[PDB]
Amino acid sequence: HLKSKKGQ
Amino acid sequence: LGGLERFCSPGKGRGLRALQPFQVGDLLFSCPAYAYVLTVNERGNHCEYCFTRKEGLSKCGRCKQAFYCNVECQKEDWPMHKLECSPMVVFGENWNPSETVRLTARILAKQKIHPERTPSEKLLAVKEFESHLDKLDNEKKDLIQSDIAALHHFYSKHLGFPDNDSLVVLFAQVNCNGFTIEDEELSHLGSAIFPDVALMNHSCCPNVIVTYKGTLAEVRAVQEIKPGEEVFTSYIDLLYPTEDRNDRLRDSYFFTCECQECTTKDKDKAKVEIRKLSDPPKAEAIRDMVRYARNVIEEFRRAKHYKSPSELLEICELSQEKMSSVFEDSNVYMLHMMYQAMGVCLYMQDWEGALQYGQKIIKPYSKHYPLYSLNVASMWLKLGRLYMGLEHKAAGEKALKKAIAIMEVAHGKDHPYISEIKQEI
Ligand SMILES: Nc1ncnc2c1ncn2[C@@H]1O[C@H](CSCC[C@H](N)C(=O)O)[C@@H](O)[C@H]1O
Ligand SMILES: [Zn+2]
Ligand SMILES: [Zn+2]
Ligand SMILES: [Zn+2]
Secondary structure: OOEOOOOO | OOOEEEEEEOOOEEEEEEOOOEOOOOEEEEEEOOEEEEOHHHEOOEOOOOOOEOOOOEEOOOOOOOEEOOHHHHHHHHHHHOOOHHHHHHHHHHOOOOHHHHHHHHHHHHHHHOOOOOOOOOOOOHHHOOOOOOOOOHHHHHHHHHHHHHHHHHHOOOOOOOOHHHHHHHHHHHHHHOEEEEOOOOOEEEEEEOOOHHHOEEOOOOOEEEEEEOOEEEEEEOOOEOOOOEOEEOOOOOOOOHHHHHHHHHHHHOOOOOOHHHHHOOOHHHHOOEOOOOOOOOHHHHHHHHHHHHHHHHHHHHHOOOOOHHHHHHHHHHHHHHHOOOEOOOOHHHHHHHHHHHHHHHHOOOHHHHHHHHHHHHHHHHHHOOOOOHHHHHHHHHHHHHHHHOOOHHHHHHHHHHHHHHHHHHHOOOOHHHHHHHHHO
16 A cells, blocks of 8 residues: 555 | 755666755655545544644534534635535445545546646656556556546546546556655554655665654655765565565565665564574474464454454464464564554553553564664554553653654654653653
């Protein structure tokens, strides 16, 4: 998905 | 953006490079959100126009599902909200457009109102976004068509839509360039298009970090940057091994990263730490447990949406004990399940179980993540707010200062967040 630092 | 310029980066397409030096902490530039959308599960807790978190938000009198700081934020957001205000009343509890569709909708509405260059597109325009249309396979085109159908399904009564082939391109552009807005605890607040921020290429040892001031993206140096040097942000969570990172990067972004962390594989050994047994797993047995861990990670992700908290804890605990026979506690796949178990405990309001997990996570997190990581900062901040809620003040303030110290660099010394955390101290 979209750019992120987390999203486990 | 005066001391910065776009250029052609060899093997990377376009990119952003510094024309002047930047020290750690320095703001490179800020970018206003071209389009943005608050996530559904954050409705009622955040203003939909400026993302200001406050209490006492005014409900949209017609839909009763949009919330605003006031009438000004209501009226200023109306052009974007009118794509949804009536469909939410009409469709009822069957208005279920994915966050991508919601964001894409606002993009098109913005092109109608403001067709000329915006303050968001000083160096890169939305129309100029990379799409990777040529790389798209069946499944990706299939997911795009499902998004296009849902766009006309819920939005036809409101927005001017271009041909199918332009929407394929736009949706592809969104996936390639889009950003998730995260809060201080790195919880999902929403999705946005930041055109000028999207110019930056990716690295697993980035020299900048993107933070948010409402709907305004801010870019700050986390490494010293020199004139002529390219500016790299990071697109993904940097906790994971090189294979994991690049599988995600090839999948979503159609590239293999070749940064120093990806070349040396420096941190992989510690990231996939094996225990010191007299009967240690074979290379095949290690391969099998790693293959299992990545499958469990994906399953838990989809399981999160529907399974009960106690069921979600169970799989976290089952995964851990199985892996703990070969993996160390500082192993990244152990850390993943520990983090997810911590989150479930927080929803369960098991504050004691949550704190327990956080304590196991923090030290390995500092090791695996780079310096000035907001992944580490938010873990400290989670730990801090847990100590403080349980009346343990020495441990709480110490952890919260650890958070502030990183957030000053990443967010800027006087970001609304830091004064929010200082009040807690
Ligand atoms: N480390 C890296 N190595 C190679 N290509 C990269 C990269 N980081 C980003 N990219 C490229 O940039 C895309 C994200 S959008 C970033 C701007 C892009 N270079 C452009 O010209 O529009 C990716 O899909 C990939 O094509
Ligand atoms: Zn507001
Ligand atoms: Zn409404
Ligand atoms: Zn890399």
